[model samples]
Target: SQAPYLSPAVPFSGTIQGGLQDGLQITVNGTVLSSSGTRFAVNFQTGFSGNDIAFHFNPRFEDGGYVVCNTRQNGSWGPEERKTHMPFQKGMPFDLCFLVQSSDFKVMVNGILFVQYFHRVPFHRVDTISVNGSVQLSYISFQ
Candidate 1:
C-alpha cells in the first residue's frame, strides 16, 4: 500500500508505487465542480503522459449523463465502452473506487457498485495514476 495523498491539485499525476496487482483497491474522494465542462477522467496509465492508458474511466454530464471506458495505446484511443448510468452529480462529493481483479476492474461510486471494465491492455503495465477535468480532489489512497 502507498501513503494517501490529501488535497492534491487537479490535473494530478502520481506513481502507483509498484504498479497494479490483483485485489488492490484505489480510492479517490472528490467533489465535482459546477463548470462549463461537466466531465472528468481518471486514468491508469503506463506513465505520466497519456500515451498508453490501460484503463480510462470517464464520466460525462451530458445527454442525461453517461460513463465512458476505454484504453489508449501509443496515444491512440480505442473504442469506448459506455455505461449509461451516472452516479455523480455536479457540486456534490463522491467516493470513487477502483478495485483491480484478475480479469477486470470493478468500479464503485458512493459505496455502490457502478461498472465493471474488462482489461483492454495489460493491467500490470499501469504504474501511474492521473486525474483531470472539472473536479476538486480531496484524497487518493491505495490499499
Candidate 2:
C-alpha cells in the first residue's frame, strides 16, 4: 500500500508507487466547482506527461452531463466511451473510487457502482495519477 495524498492542489499529478496491480484500489475525495469550468478529468497514466494515458476518466457538464472514458497512446486518443447518467452535481462533494481488476477498472461514486472501463493497454504501465480541471480535492488514497 502507498501513503495517502491529502489536500492536494488542482491540476495535481502524483506518482503511484510500484505502478498499478490487480486488486489495487484508489479513492479520490473532492468537490466539483460550480463556476471554474464545465469539465474535470482523472487519469491513470504511464508517467508524468499526458502523452500516454492508460485510463482517462473525464466528466463533462455540457450536453445534459455525461462522463467520457478512453485511453491514449503516444499522444493519440482512442475511441471514447460515454456514460450518459451523470452521478455528480456541481458544487457538490463526491467520493469516487477506482478499483483495479484484472480485466477492467470498476468505478464507484458515493459508494455506488458507476462505470466499468475495460483496459486498452497494459494496466501495470500506469504509474501516475493525475487530476485536472474544475474541482477541489480533499484527499487521494491508495489501498
Q: Which is the leading candidate under TM-score?
A: 2
Residue 119 in candidate 1, Cα distance off native in Å: 0.6
Query: CA shift at 34, candidate 1, in angstroms?
Result: 1.7
**Candidate 1 TM-score to native:** 0.97
lDDT of 1: 0.93
Regions of candidate 1 where Cα sits further than 4 Å from its true position: none
Pick out the ten consecutive residues of candidate 2 with the lowest summed lDDT: 1-10
What RMSD value applies to candidate 2?
0.8
Residues 1-143, model 2: lDDT tens digits:
37889999999999999999999999999999989589999999998889999999999999999999999999999999999988988999999999999999999999999999999999999999999999999999999
Per model, state how many residue pairs clash.
Answer: 0, 0
lDDT of each: 0.93, 0.95
